[PDB]
Design a protein around this motif. Structure first.
Motif, PDB file in Angstrom:
ATOM      1  N   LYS A  68       0.873  -1.175   0.000  1.00 18.99           N
ATOM      2  CA  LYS A  68       0.000   0.000   0.000  1.00 18.99           C
ATOM      3  C   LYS A  68       0.908   1.222   0.000  1.00 18.99           C
ATOM      4  O   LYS A  68       1.138   1.830   1.048  1.00 18.99           O
ATOM      5  CB  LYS A  68      -0.930  -0.002   1.211  1.00 18.99           C
ATOM      6  N   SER A  69       1.391   1.602  -1.185  1.00 21.81           N
ATOM      7  CA  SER A  69       2.294   2.736  -1.296  1.00 21.81           C
ATOM      8  C   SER A  69       2.349   3.190  -2.740  1.00 21.81           C
ATOM      9  O   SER A  69       2.550   2.353  -3.630  1.00 21.81           O
ATOM     10  CB  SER A  69       3.701   2.384  -0.812  1.00 21.81           C
ATOM     11  N   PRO A  70       2.214   4.490  -3.015  1.00 24.97           N
ATOM     12  CA  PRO A  70       2.125   4.961  -4.402  1.00 24.97           C
ATOM     13  C   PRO A  70       3.449   5.041  -5.143  1.00 24.97           C
ATOM     14  O   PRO A  70       3.486   5.621  -6.232  1.00 24.97           O
ATOM     15  CB  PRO A  70       1.506   6.360  -4.248  1.00 24.97           C
ATOM     16  N   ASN A  71       4.536   4.504  -4.603  1.00 22.86           N
ATOM     17  CA  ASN A  71       5.759   4.340  -5.371  1.00 22.86           C
ATOM     18  C   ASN A  71       5.856   2.957  -5.993  1.00 22.86           C
ATOM     19  O   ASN A  71       6.892   2.628  -6.588  1.00 22.86           O
ATOM     20  CB  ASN A  71       6.978   4.610  -4.491  1.00 22.86           C
ATOM     21  N   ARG A  72       4.778   2.171  -5.876  1.00 24.95           N
ATOM     22  CA  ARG A  72       4.779   0.753  -6.215  1.00 24.95           C
ATOM     23  C   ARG A  72       5.154   0.511  -7.668  1.00 24.95           C
ATOM     24  O   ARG A  72       5.914  -0.415  -7.974  1.00 24.95           O
ATOM     25  CB  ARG A  72       3.399   0.170  -5.921  1.00 24.95           C
ATOM     26  N   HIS A  73       4.670   1.367  -8.568  1.00 22.41           N
ATOM     27  CA  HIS A  73       4.968   1.211  -9.984  1.00 22.41           C
ATOM     28  C   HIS A  73       6.442   1.435 -10.273  1.00 22.41           C
ATOM     29  O   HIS A  73       7.022   0.748 -11.124  1.00 22.41           O
ATOM     30  CB  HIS A  73       4.115   2.168 -10.798  1.00 22.41           C
ATOM     31  N   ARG A  74       7.089   2.346  -9.541  1.00 22.25           N
ATOM     32  CA  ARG A  74       8.526   2.500  -9.733  1.00 22.25           C
ATOM     33  C   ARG A  74       9.311   1.339  -9.145  1.00 22.25           C
ATOM     34  O   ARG A  74      10.512   1.226  -9.417  1.00 22.25           O
ATOM     35  CB  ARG A  74       9.014   3.815  -9.136  1.00 22.25           C
ATOM     36  N   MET A  75       8.658   0.491  -8.350  1.00 24.13           N
ATOM     37  CA  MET A  75       9.232  -0.795  -7.987  1.00 24.13           C
ATOM     38  C   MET A  75       9.469  -1.651  -9.225  1.00 24.13           C
ATOM     39  O   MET A  75      10.475  -2.362  -9.318  1.00 24.13           O
ATOM     40  CB  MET A  75       8.278  -1.529  -7.043  1.00 24.13           C
ATOM     41  N   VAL A  76       8.560  -1.576 -10.191  1.00 22.87           N
ATOM     42  CA  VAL A  76       8.413  -2.619 -11.201  1.00 22.87           C
ATOM     43  C   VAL A  76       9.394  -2.447 -12.352  1.00 22.87           C
ATOM     44  O   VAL A  76       9.932  -3.437 -12.858  1.00 22.87           O
ATOM     45  CB  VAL A  76       6.952  -2.621 -11.686  1.00 22.87           C
ATOM     46  N   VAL A  77       9.664  -1.198 -12.743  1.00 28.44           N
ATOM     47  CA  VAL A  77      10.346  -0.888 -14.001  1.00 28.44           C
ATOM     48  C   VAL A  77      11.783  -1.408 -14.016  1.00 28.44           C
ATOM     49  O   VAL A  77      12.294  -1.820 -15.066  1.00 28.44           O
ATOM     50  CB  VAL A  77      10.276   0.637 -14.232  1.00 28.44           C
ATOM     51  N   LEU A  78      12.427  -1.454 -12.856  1.00 30.44           N
ATOM     52  CA  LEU A  78      13.844  -1.781 -12.766  1.00 30.44           C
ATOM     53  C   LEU A  78      14.113  -3.259 -13.035  1.00 30.44           C
ATOM     54  O   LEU A  78      13.295  -4.133 -12.741  1.00 30.44           O
ATOM     55  CB  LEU A  78      14.362  -1.371 -11.387  1.00 30.44           C
TER      56      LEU A  78
END
Lengths: 617, 617
Positions: B308-318
């Motif tokens: 539950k955190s809005p940086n979650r998508h920047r988790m994915v790209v790397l």
């Protein structure tokens, strides 16, 4: 007629065996050897250097201002022979204590201009030969107003303080020939520290300079006169420098006077006391003397109903005000919801009454009496509000407006009710208008919730600043076009009977009836197309005006003004209802911090990861 | 009632021939020579230093915290005579092992505050005389929650780790008087590395500091206890520091724990292995242990249905997550298109059924049975989905909404079908509403294509955050105005029979009928103009709210959330249908990289011209 300059190399002087212009030339050149022979003449005709002949015309300035306004590298050799000659003259009105007698420079000293020329030796020479540092200068130029003026508190010491003169302040403050008392004041009533908080601004570096001057002066005062305390001395307005700097709303100097810390010596002259620090968290006892709501004139009530400055909301966000505000709000949120419940049940009864009226007779009589009593109670509430805060509509037209809606809703519903008691009609339009203004009036209570509050504070200011402009630029041209078309058509029976379909044509639903019977079909059509193009033009001007504010808006200010508007709720809420006076809960804790000193302090627990990491190497 | 401070120079102590306050004053001053005579008194009355008299009232803090909170340049001479005196006292409850017995500071050690004061000599003096480093401090202040608290994992070593104390960590970790075991844990169940990933943030430099502390501790652990591996130890939540730092979604520490490299020594304690580099291209075997989808609780499933955190998508790209995601998507895109074909043919049959129904009887019976079976199959699919991911609607209301539309479409079409089997009507509104919600439901499948995906992810979040607000601020005032006009008119036969033409007048096509028969033509007109102006006002507020987001939006986030939404497709897609369980394809390759170590690795071929040029001189 413009006031003359006090000095010019070109505009000599008006008039409104040596001579006056001879003396002015010899003091302006700085040559000290043509001064000889003047003493015998002055004894011959029995005249003084401050007398009506050798003085100026309207300003009345004597020769020593001409002396000190010609200081070659801060040096003039002409002052001492003039002082010796006037001492040999035997004059009661002392030349050293000369004051400018003009209205525009009332009571202006030679010492003030000596300070402005920043020659410490000339100031020392004036004060060593019998000056007086208690000669205020109360000209209207020396006061504060709009335009070309300069306010510094009218005292020589205050004028020394405003211009970084550390050495001069020290050479004035303790010289044994004339002591410069620190707790002297102006003709307005302000002190030197009030002058320093008056001359400040919002820039980062000028404020820091005033802060350094301020706490240097405060340490000097702590050393000089420790029996008296300079912080609480109130002016003719009855304000501390804290309260005065609040009233003029200067953001940075308020921040420094609120929170500050001096270690070792000068420790009891501070308003912050660190209790314990633990990693990123830190608990420090803030002072709250003369800022709690218990006192008669706090900084909270001053920042609520006295300040006129748009930085006011950034006053509020900083600690320790916002923590104390949240504690009061935690105390008062239940009674706020009780007021919410009262208003909601009154509204639902009003809406029920507004349906079936013109066992049913019993509940209808119930609603009639209950709305009458609710209106009378709300109206007396609004009357006691405007009895209390008299000038607030000239403080904040754009923040008292919900109070205005409360007042007008109550008076209009009681006007509708007394019109019901009258036989005469038109009570139903007043009743339905009161219902509509009340239904729109159910938005001050959205102050209570953060979720609608953050979303809702953004609209009212930007809409009320320009929607009124758009409406009142449009109504005049609508009236002119309606006059035009009722002139040409002579439907269009009346002016308003044209303006109605013009306004509904602007919406587009309501048709307007052009006429093909008259010959002027094309003139009517062309006039209406001119109306269309100009209405689109003013609409686009409104759109561009709003797109200014959509980029100029900064979202931190929303949170700031929401906390401010909670404050403007909670002061009034804490004051309590007019029909039951409220015991004021004393804030803070009484506690021993100094020596046999004793203060009310207040603990906060602030955490800041950034500063704590910046401490960590 | 607020909890007291653990220390104050002002708030002495509550109570909830030497004396207790005498002892507190003599330990707070730091003078060591008034301590004499106390031992004989303590033997006289048979009392201990941790006993109920000399301790604190509610906190229960003994004198050694007062000692270590007065450390002049980190030094106090009073601690050693107290330790010697208490050793002469013969006390079972050891003063060195004292714990604060308050709820707010449960189990707080003297050693923790000694660490916080960062005096290595005082910590050494406590540990050399019989401390214990396995004394956790499980107060609720020491846990993590909202407000003024500080969570660090409750252990002395973890607290030493959180505050850069390299020297203190070394002096604790191997001193032979009490070994500080690295694999000790907290009362929550976390380890020291879990505490380091908990205390992190998203800033560039605090994260780098935590990284340096982290890999220093990991090399120290590799040197100390190589038999145990600290990376895979799971907490009471059953999470690795990888998985926990994923669950709290801290972007930078996840990046460093995923990709990292240690050369020479400490080589098997890394998760990246370079295979061959060739100019700008580089192939390196990434580790994938406990991150592949084959395992029970991967980082993929955690970042899908637990974060539950809005940086979650920047988790994915790397990398290496997105390459593994694309490989799974290349495996599954055909079955995704098969599901597309199934849904499309079901929809076309539904649209055919929705036209001619209320050889034609044969195909109509065919469509009736086929829609019934399609609805029952889709409904069981949605039931197994919500059986699996129970809490996801309290995870992502704004990302589970297509699943909600699937569920409601299936249940509403089967409700329409069973209403068809019932005699009673209103089955056609349910059927047509199911068709409409299905037709709008053909937009999750636009997830599959990049061309519509990049264009289509921008709308849903920004529209759903404010359109609901605009609708539910408008409906209430529309209801109030309809009540107003049905009050004044008493057309306007009913409230909804006013609100309909008001809403269609807002569109402008649907006319509303003013009345010239009643006397209140102007009051009705003025009320409608008030409606017009307020509706324009709230419309402009919506426009300004959207122009906030049109400048705040950054186009990289669109690509990021599109890849994330592909991930949220592909995890569920890989899990397979409820009526046929799926064999999970093992990812990665089993390979020998260490020593007799053996890992699953995974090759990627990354190219970067900028870094390769920056290598080139």
């Amino acid at each position: 007629q413009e006031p003359p300059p006090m000095e010019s190399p070109f505009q000599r002087e008006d008039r409104n065996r040596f001579d006056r212009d001879r003396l002015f030339s010899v003091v302006s050149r700085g040559v000290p050897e043509e001064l000889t022979g003047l003493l015998e003449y002055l004894r011959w005709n029995s005249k003084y250097l401050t007398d009506s002949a050798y003085t100026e015309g309207s300003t009345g300035k004597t020769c020593l201002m001409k002396a000190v306004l010609n200081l070659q590298d801060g040096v003039n050799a002409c002052i001492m022979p003039l002082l010796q000659i006037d001492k040999d003259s035997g004059n009661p009105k002392l030349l050293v204590n000369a004051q400018c007698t003009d209205e525009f420079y009332q009571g202006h000293s030679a010492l003030h201009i000596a300070i402005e020329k920043r020659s410490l030796q000339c100031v020392k020479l004036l004060v060593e030969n019998g000056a007086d540092v208690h000669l205020r200068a109360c000209g209207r130029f020396f006061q504060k107003h709009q335009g070309t003026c300069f306010y510094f508190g009218e005292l020589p010491l205050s004028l020394a303080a405003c211009t970084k003169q550390w050495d001069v302040v020290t050479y004035l403050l303790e010289n044994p020939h004339q002591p410069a008392s620190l707790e002297a004041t102006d003709s307005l009533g302000n002190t030197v520290l009030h002058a320093l908080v008056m001359i400040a601004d919002n820039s980062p570096e000028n404020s820091a300079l005033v802060i350094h001057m301020y706490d240097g002066l405060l340490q000097m005062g702590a050393r000089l006169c420790p029996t008296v305390q300079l912080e609480e001395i109130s002016n003719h307005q009855g304000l501390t420098p804290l309260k005065l700097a609040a009233k003029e709303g200067k953001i940075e100097i308020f921040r420094h006077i609120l929170q500050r810390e001096f270690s070792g010596p000068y420790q009891p002259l501070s308003r912050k006391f660190t209790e314990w620090c633990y990693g990123p968290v830190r608990v420090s006892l803030y002072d709250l003397s003369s800022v709690d709501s218990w006192e008669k004139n706090s900084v909270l009530e001053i920042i609520a109903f006295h300040c006129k400055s748009p930085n006011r909301h950034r006053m509020v966000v900083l600690e320790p005000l916002n923590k104390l505000l949240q504690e009061k709000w935690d105390r008062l949120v239940s009674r706020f919801f009780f007021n919410f419940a009262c208003y909601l049940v009154y509204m639902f009864i009003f809406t029920v009454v507004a349906y079936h009226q013109p066992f049913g007779e019993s509940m209808l009589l119930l609603g009639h009496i209950l709305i009458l009593l609710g209106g009378i109670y709300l109206l007396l509430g609004q009357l006691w509000y405007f009895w209390r805060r008299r000038l607030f509509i000239w403080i904040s037209f754009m923040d008292s407006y919900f109070e205005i809606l409360f007042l007008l809703q109550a008076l209009l519903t009681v006007l509708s009710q007394v019109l019901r008691f009258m036989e005469t009609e038109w009570y139903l339009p007043l009743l339905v208008l009161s219902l509509v203004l009340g239904w729109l009036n159910l938005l001050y209570y959205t102050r209570g919730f953060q979720h609608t509050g953050i979303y809702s504070v953004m609209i009212q200011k930007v809409i009320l600043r320009d929607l009124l402009r758009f409406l009142l630029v449009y109504l005049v041209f609508l009236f002119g076009f309606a006059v035009a078309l009722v002139s040409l058509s002579r439907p269009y029976r009346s002016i308003l009977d044209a303006s109605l379909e013009l306004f509904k044509f602007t919406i587009g639903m309501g048709e307007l009836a052009f006429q093909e019977q008259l010959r002027f079909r094309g003139v009517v059509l062309l006039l209406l197309l001119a109306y269309v193009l100009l209405t689109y033009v003013l609409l686009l001007n409104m759109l561009i005006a709003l797109m200014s504010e959509t980029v100029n808006h900064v979202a931190d200010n929303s949170w700031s003004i929401w906390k401010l508007q909670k404050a403007i709720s909670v002061l009034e809420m804490e004051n309590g209802y007019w029909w039951c006076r409220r015991k004021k809960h004393r804030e803070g804790r009484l506690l021993k911090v100094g020596t046999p000193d004793e203060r009310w302090c207040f603990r906060v627990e602030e955490v800041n990861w950034a500063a704590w990491e910046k401490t960590l190497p």
